[PDB]
């Protein structure tokens, strides 16, 4: 339906007014970018599924979500994949990885004071029957 449709372009109007915020902030800026395999050839390799912020507006943009839920995945996945790829003790690895937390922290925090739960849940309604 038409609400339903107003629904959804609520949601990425939030969505994107979080990643906004989140792309903004110096510490998050190694993640606003897809990794370059001409600095990282093996980047490719061992992370599967590459994300950054970047790819996630893109990804509101096309659609691609239609809860909170499903981006926060995407939230998730960059977290992970920093964590996964930079593993060390040294302070390069470490910076990144207290980076990565922190762009996630910030992320759920921002979606904990923000959003509606009772708009989560009209989202997942919607989804849930299509
Ligand atoms: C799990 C996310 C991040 N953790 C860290 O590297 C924290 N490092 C320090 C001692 O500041
Ligand atoms: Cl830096």
């Not at 990794?35 to 390799?45: A, M, N, W």
């Not at 922190?102 to 992320?107: G, S, Y």
């Not at 925090?109 to 989202?123: S, T, W």
């Amino acid at each position: 339906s038409m609400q339903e449709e107003d629904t959804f372009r609520e949601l990425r109007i939030f969505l994107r007014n979080v990643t906004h915020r989140l792309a903004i902030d110096k510490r998050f800026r190694v993640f606003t970018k897809p990794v370059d395999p001409d600095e990282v050839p093996d980047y490719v390799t061992v992370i599967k599924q590459p994300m950054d912020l970047s790819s996630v507006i893109s990804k509101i943009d096309l659609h691609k979500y239609l809860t909170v839920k499903d981006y926060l995945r995407d939230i998730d996945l960059i977290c992970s994949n920093a964590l996964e790829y930079n593993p060390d003790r040294d302070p390069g690895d470490r910076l990144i990885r207290h980076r990565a937390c922190a762009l996630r922290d910030t992320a759920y925090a921002i979606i904990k004071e923000e959003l509606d739960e009772d708009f989560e849940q009209l989202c997942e309604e919607i989804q849930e029957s299509r």
